[PDB]
Design a protein around this ligand. Sequence first.
Ligand code: GTP
Ligand code: GDP
Ligand code: GDP
Ligand code: MG
Lengths: 426, 426, 35, 32, 409
Amino acid sequence: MREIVHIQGGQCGNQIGAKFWEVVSDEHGIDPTGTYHGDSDLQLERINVYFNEATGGRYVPRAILMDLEPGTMDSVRSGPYGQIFRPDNFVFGQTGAGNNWAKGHYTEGAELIDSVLDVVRKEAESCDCLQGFQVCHSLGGGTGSGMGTLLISKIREEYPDRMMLTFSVVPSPKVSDTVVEPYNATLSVHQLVENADECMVLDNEALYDICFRTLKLTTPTFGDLNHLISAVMSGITCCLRFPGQLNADLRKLAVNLIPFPRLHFFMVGFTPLTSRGSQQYRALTVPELTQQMWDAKNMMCAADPRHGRYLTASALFRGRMSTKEVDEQMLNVQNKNSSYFVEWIPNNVKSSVCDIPPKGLKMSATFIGNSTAIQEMFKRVSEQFTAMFRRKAFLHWYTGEGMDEMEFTEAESNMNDLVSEYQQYQ
Amino acid sequence: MREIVHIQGGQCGNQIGAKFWEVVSDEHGIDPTGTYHGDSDLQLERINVYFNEATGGRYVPRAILMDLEPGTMDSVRSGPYGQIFRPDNFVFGQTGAGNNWAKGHYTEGAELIDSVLDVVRKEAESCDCLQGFQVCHSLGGGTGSGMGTLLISKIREEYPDRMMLTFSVVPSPKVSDTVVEPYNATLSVHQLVENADECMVLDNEALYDICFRTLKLTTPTFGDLNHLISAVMSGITCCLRFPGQLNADLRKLAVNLIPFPRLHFFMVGFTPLTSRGSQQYRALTVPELTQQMWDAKNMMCAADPRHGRYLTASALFRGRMSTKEVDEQMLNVQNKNSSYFVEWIPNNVKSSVCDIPPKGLKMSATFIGNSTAIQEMFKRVSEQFTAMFRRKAFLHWYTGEGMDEMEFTEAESNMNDLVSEYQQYQ
Amino acid sequence: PFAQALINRLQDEGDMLARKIVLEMRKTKMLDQQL
Amino acid sequence: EAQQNDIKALRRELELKKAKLNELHEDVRRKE
Amino acid sequence: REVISIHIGQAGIQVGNACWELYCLEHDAFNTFFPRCIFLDLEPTVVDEVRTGTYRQLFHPEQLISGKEDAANNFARGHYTIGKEIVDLALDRIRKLADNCTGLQGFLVFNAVGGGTGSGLGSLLLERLSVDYGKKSKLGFTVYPSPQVSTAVVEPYNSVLSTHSLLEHTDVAVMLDNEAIYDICRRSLDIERPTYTNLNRLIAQVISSLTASLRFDGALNVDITEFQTNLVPYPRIHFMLSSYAPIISAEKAYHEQLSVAEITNAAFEPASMMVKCDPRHGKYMACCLMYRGDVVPKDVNASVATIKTKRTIQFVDWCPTGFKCGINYQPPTVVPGGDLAKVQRAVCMISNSTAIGEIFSRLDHKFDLMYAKRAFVHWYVGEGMEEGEFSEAREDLAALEKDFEEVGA
Ligand SMILES: Nc1nc2c(ncn2[C@@H]2O[C@H](COP(=O)(O)OP(=O)(O)OP(=O)(O)O)[C@@H](O)[C@H]2O)c(=O)[nH]1
Ligand SMILES: Nc1nc2c(ncn2[C@@H]2O[C@H](COP(=O)(O)OP(=O)(O)O)[C@@H](O)[C@H]2O)c(=O)[nH]1
Ligand SMILES: Nc1nc2c(ncn2[C@@H]2O[C@H](COP(=O)(O)OP(=O)(O)O)[C@@H](O)[C@H]2O)c(=O)[nH]1
Ligand SMILES: [Mg+2]
């Protein structure tokens, strides 16, 4: 009944989504072949949200992979749980944009996006009651940013009354993989503030920091980063798939965390996330989940919230817990550190509990906080955008494709008034 | 009871018919040596519609091969299911027409048409209650088109009440094998509009296009294309051979899809058609069969039905299914896409359900839409015909054989008045 | 050659379809008050 | 070649307009 | 006392294939049925499924009549061309079935008017039965095509051309749609994907409930001659809405408390009619209530009182006593593989109203639109008809519409 269609764009989207479908399918007891082999009847009750039964226990994921170079598509079918995707859902171009947001949004998008739209239509009408769409992509690249953002705009004018999640990693100076990161990020955010219902900010810098201190990993390849991101996505939509003492759906979270239609950029964290050396010395109670949740060194963005103010915050708990303990912990962390919270909204924290833990742990949690400190990223990105655009660097690759100069000035103005408007409510 | 006499003409007719008798013999469980070896009781009681018990359980088909070149006869006799025909039924000239419609219709047919009529008569009165004849030929070749067309006219003079099916392929300029395609196809249609009962139009563009896109074959030889055409022909006469919850014979379909006597050119489609790599990634439901049925990119003609309107449509279903789902699906497509259907006719879809699926499948479907988009090809042909005939290209090869200038003008006249009546009823 | 006539047919048909689309918008907007 | 592009653009526009018309017709039927 | 049943067409004998299964499973009381039947069709495929089925030995071989080739959804073909050779053999058997009988109550015919065999040779059989017997009742339970759910295309032509004879030949005509029954199985029986078999099973329930008064002794019995008076106030107004209660699954039945008061109500809501029409637009002329099983006359008496005092539904100004009750003792039987649970008591209501005047008016436009452009007419005319009978059948339904509007006032 409540249903989520999943869309992965670009190389960043494909690896994130790949590790994501392994985690969910393993939760529902479906083997790499795609046949049911679980034991509990509870695992079957809520597979309509992410899968379709094909025939003889075969469950296919409700996902759409979309990119421009076949290296990512072949890397997906090679790995395990690669044989579960329907091959027709691999809608796919051939030429390649290559870190050019104009190529991703004006030239190659104009002939690929009709195809990806047609697949999405079939996937949306194949089911009955849409809850929303779920899009994972990056903001630095071209085939994820420009094409994915165009897909977001096209979908929002098609189904305007449904929710839409987008999980986007954003560039930062310390992790600078491409050179035109600001020219891509600023134009992408301009479209996200006017189209997406809510966004969940991510970055690669914080993920590297998490893998160093908390995980204490030796060799953090991209597999572990995608593992953390996947655990977050599974944690937020766990409420629709399993019953609990206090269920909180996506729309219930959106209206509870967004006070104003333009303030929809969240920073996310997940607990418990501990190294194997210290996972043995730990206890599993509600206070230990909270004081590891609300730690600033556990956020998955490089935007320290104590440099700002919290508007609202949310925690999604999983496992057999006592709701009294849940509420008193949120009360304690809001009363002590009262300065870090907004003043004209009491009880800034929405809370919910679900009665199914992830496999391998006894009790877990998921934090979603809408702070005002997210403006550090907007100023941090806009100055690099300004530093090149005052001098017309790299501009002709954008200009000679169809974009003119007022597009950059309008994008600058909207990003600049956005960080200004975050600052006023701060 | 009801009887179907088979007549094949030309190279196209012989090779299409060869694959046809392969799949029908397997459906009735008859071995390549002619003896019954099936398992179910159901396969015995309705083999008289296609076979004759000779002696010692020898079931020989009720077919007539007809051509002018021995290469096709020897290739037929060589392969399997080649030693099941009666050698007396291989009525066969010796000189050959060779893509000259005049040879196959006035000169060489004049000495063969006597022998075919002798065989078809003796083969017709051998059975009690004739249902009709079933012809498979082409409209580009000479001995297929011209002789087969002349045979159609003579048969309709003798048996004017009995039914008549014609599976005919038409030439298209994108796949143009011979140079005199317009000269042949135009004259052939002139005789088809007045002699046949209904004609199921085929083409090679859509067949090659279907095997590329949907089937995703690598090397689609004539074997696979002839395999698809045979599956259509088995689907159209499954109602006679097997009991069902709602039966629809040949005459039943003809009266529900032909609203005016000259409007008897159909488009055909077969479902389900899926690649071998994706056969297990899908369900088998009635809605899935309907989505593949009403796709405009699935007709076996090169005429997009969305370029016009449907007058009527028909869906023959095979398999254990609920009749309610059949009618609800037909009503749904009748309401949402309201502009593509004619207005002064409600209920443009006749449906039927048989209880026996084709061998190897669970549920199949055959679509026969009588649309007004078929007039594009007649215009698509007539423009070529006028291009030659304005300037008497290749004309003497036919003129020195008996055709005069009035015959070609008459063929243009019939083609032009036909395209106006399709345009009238749109 | 013949495409020159095809563009006329397609242009006139597209314009007439716009007129039908316009009238239908008023019809649904008229029923929405009655509801 | 130019007129060919005109043909393939007018039909696509015509197709989009026909799809919109169907939507409007469907809404009238439900609302009645 | 015995009554024989005729079944015509693909729909007719499939309904009979379920109806006779119930009769054998239900059973001196048998004397009225034991079979006194005749199947007849033009296509041999469905009749010869019976000849090889489980009930091979049950039916005498001659009974199962079967032609050579189908009428193919063609009223003219099944009424003028092909009917003419098989109808004589059929009715010249039915005669000796009646001579076997002594106290014939009547005949009952099963046909669907959309097809050619059910419609064409249905009317043809009816015309020779009316001239041969005249006085003996012939109950026709027909299946009319639904407004929005439909399987054929030319069925408006058939339905009008069949009705023109169904007026003045049958005595008591019960409408039954497919969408209404589909809705019943979806709503009450909660079967989301039904087929023809489930429809035919509950159609047999209605037939059994109106002949159980002849078969078994009740507190207040009612014959077929009784419906002839108590429900048709005019010689040409005999078209009956049908309903049944409780149509209920196996689990819900135990949970709910089935009684006489609420099932008399449930048999009156338009959510349970066997014909897709809303009797809120119409006024009830007469109602007939067959009660089976565990029924005392008091609560049925009390139930008709509450209906009369309600104002959600209205009666004609003519009938203060607008009801006919009937009570029988034996409860309804169940079929293994059937979906209806065993109930102590059930109600089959047969009413007459002006809501039926809507279905004919709805039918008129579809027939009118096609006929104006002369669609499909060339098939019927070459079969042996003319433009005369198309136009004259049209004006016959026009007269019927004015008739219902006049009587309803
Ligand atoms: N309730 C019910 N209706 C049926 C059944 N089978 C067919 N029908 C109805 O019959 C109508 C068409 O007539 P058919 O009985 O199928 O065929 P026919 O009356 O014998 O006429 P021909 O096709 O010419 O032989 C359709 O509109 C169906 O609604 C059935 O099993 N149960
Ligand atoms: N977390 C994570 N990030 C990735 C992965 N692969 C690429 N990225 C990010 O993607 C950014 C560059 O974007 P790119 O992959 O070129 O996007 P695209 O070309 O539009 O598909 C870099 O900043 C990387 O941090 C991965 O497997 N995991
Ligand atoms: N589908 C199919 N088409 C064929 C086959 N052989 C020939 N054709 C078509 O037939 C046309 C030529 O017809 P031809 O064989 O010369 O007919 P004939 O000379 O009268 O027997 C060509 O356009 C081919 O595409 C076949 O085996 N299968
Ligand atoms: Mg029939």
